[PDB]
Amino acid sequence: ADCAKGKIEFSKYNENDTFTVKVAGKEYWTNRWNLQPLLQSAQLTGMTVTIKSSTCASGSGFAEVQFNND
Amino acid sequence: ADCAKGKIEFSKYNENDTFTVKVAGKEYWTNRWNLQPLLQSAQLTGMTVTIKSSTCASGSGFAEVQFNND
Amino acid sequence: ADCAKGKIEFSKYNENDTFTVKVAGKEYWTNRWNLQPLLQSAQLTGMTVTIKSSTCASGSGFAEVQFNND
Amino acid sequence: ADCAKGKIEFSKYNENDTFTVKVAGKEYWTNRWNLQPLLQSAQLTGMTVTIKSSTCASGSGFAEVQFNND
Amino acid sequence: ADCAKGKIEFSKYNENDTFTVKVAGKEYWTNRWNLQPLLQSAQLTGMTVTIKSSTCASGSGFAEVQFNND
Amino acid sequence: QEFTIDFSTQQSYVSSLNSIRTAISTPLEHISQGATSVSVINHTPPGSYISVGIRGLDVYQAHFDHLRLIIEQNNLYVAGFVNTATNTFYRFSDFAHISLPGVTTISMTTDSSYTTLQRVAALERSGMQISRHSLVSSYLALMEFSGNTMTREASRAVLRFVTVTAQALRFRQIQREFRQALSETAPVYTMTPEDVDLTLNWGRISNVLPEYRGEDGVRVGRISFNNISAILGTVAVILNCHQPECQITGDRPVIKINNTLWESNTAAAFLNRKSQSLYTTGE
């Protein structure tokens, strides 16, 4: 499901080597190390990201995300 | 074959850790991780890319892409 | 604990393969290799980073950090 | 020997996971995955690169390259 | 010790997978693959780098480096 | 059209360049502060040029004003130089499209690029020195030139005159740093690595600055303008983008990041870094 869509408000590197972003007021984390530079890049260049997951509660995990340039 | 040439309209990280881009109105995915940051940087700046593959149908995989300056 | 917060004054790759950044007048190192390019991009663009550690003594190690834009 | 000197006309990720650049009208490929982001960055910023290799025929391999601001 | 401070004049990827930079008129090389993206990014953005090594004569190696925007 | 760069004093030098700028370019709405601006070259037809007379290098000389430099207008490239005492126009090979009525045109073997000129001159722009004295010898060298093959001494003269004419026109920083050599103190101007790097990014700067709208700073590759006054103090004239030198790749001139305007290609060039995790072999 499309959990959240918007700019990245903050990103965070977590001590367990996971990575979190806040999109549309709700936080989501991911385990995939390849997404860390992709997400920080989106945050810095103003890309609209669409977090996609089967579990969309704030604080939940994800591993699918679309990137649009604005 | 040259399957599609143009700007990257959107990109998407997939749950199976593949990576999708839309070029010239068609979608293609790749399993080569090294291409992920290279393709996103092409997207941010409006670089026109050329997707090459034996399979050019929307939805097909690819592993060869040219980065052009025009 | 939020150990320090601000723009990255300088960064430094160390002989022991760790990476240190100076924030709010205090230095902090991390052995997390994925943070090296992320912290450099943050320093280059003047991101406001928040260093989070169980040990906030200047010169102490860390492995958690938040990245914010202006 | 200095095979070619000039800016990158195009770059290309190849299906065998090598990376091709065309410099001064000739094409050269390399096997070092580390050179893929380095070579694209040079193309993006218009760096003058000097391909160095035992074999300077167009279509030949290389693994040494100088990145100049000139 | 602090061997050289300034912007990177050029960099070179060497056949042996090491990486060379020229700072303040002298050359230095490193074996750490992780300095390759950091050093080149410093070059193309014009950061002022500070090379640090027990060995400070041109043509000598290093594995300690500070990055400043100014 | 015809213009003159008068090297008599610092003020005549600055006024000369400003008169050329006023005629061939238009200030940017968002980067000007009185009579000091960043100006965009007005589009002229291909082959359009200006003939710039050189004067005032030795005021004890009523006949040292016979060197001219032909400068293509859309790009401020020096196409060649004219000896008015012998009515001979020595023209670089990449400018066959520039023709002058009533002057003996000599088509030369080599081109106008700094790469060609530095090689023949055995002199790099970085660290090159220019004084009133060495400009006089530069004038002598060009007026004593003959043939169709540039020499070391003529190439050194061109490199010096390009910096203090065309490059000074583009960059207020080069104008300001060089004009000190026109003092009675007669100091020596050294072209710094920073000066050279500015000329290597002229097209890149030209593509970015039109998008400026009051941001705290501007970043273009290795160039940093940390406030708007740093822009005006460095840049005087830029190309008209929308010229081939305006674009490297892509089509997005800038990315605004934290009230700093970045050349998008610069950001892309340090954002394409994979997870350092993957720096591995054979596992």
Residue numbers in the entry:
A (entry chain D), B (entry chain I), C (entry chain H), D (entry chain C), E (entry chain E): 1 to 70
F (entry chain B): 1 to 242, 257 to 297
Which statements did the authors publish about this structure?
Shiga toxin (Stx) is the major virulence factor of STEC and is an AB5 toxin consisting of a single A-subunit associated with 5 B-subunits (AB5). The A-subunit encodes an active N-glycosidase that binds to the 60S ribosomal subunit and removes a conserved adenine residue from the 28S rRNA, which inhibits host cell translation and results in cell death. The B-subunit is a receptor-binding protein. Recently, we identified a new subtype of Stx2, designated as Stx2k, in strains isolated from a broad range of hosts in China, including diarrheal patients, goat, pig, and raw meat (beef and mutton).
Considering the difficulty of purifying large quantities of Stx2k from wild type pathogenic bacteria, a recombinant construct encoding a non-toxic toxoid of Stx2k was generated by converting the glutamic acid at position 167 to glutamine (Stx2kE167Q). The E167Q mutation was chosen because E167 is known to be the active site residue for known ribosomal inactivating proteins (RIPs), including the Stxs, and because the E167Q mutation does not alter the structure of RIPs. Molecular-replacement resulted in a solution with two biological units in the crystallographic asymmetric unit. Each biological unit is composed of one A-subunit and five B-subunits. For the A-subunit, residues 243–256 were flexible and could not be located in the electron density map in one of the biological units, and residues 244–257 of the A-subunit in the other biological unit could not be located. As expected, based on sequence identity, the structures of Stx2kE167Q and Stx2a are similar. The most notable similarity was the helix close to the C-terminus of the A-subunit, which was packed in the cavity at the center of the pentameric complex of the B-subunit. Superimposing the active center residues of Stx2a and Stx2kE167Q revealed minimal changes in their spatial configuration, suggesting that any variation in toxin potency may be due to the internalization of the toxins dictated by the B-subunit, rather than the enzymatic activity of the A-subunit. In the crystal structure of Stx2k toxoid, there is a HEPES molecule in the active center of the A-subunit. Residues important for receptor-interaction have been identified by structural studies of Stx2a in complex with its receptor or receptor analogues. These residues constitute three sites for association with the host cell and are conserved between Stx2a and Stx2k except for AA16, which is part of site 1, and AA31, which is part of site 2.
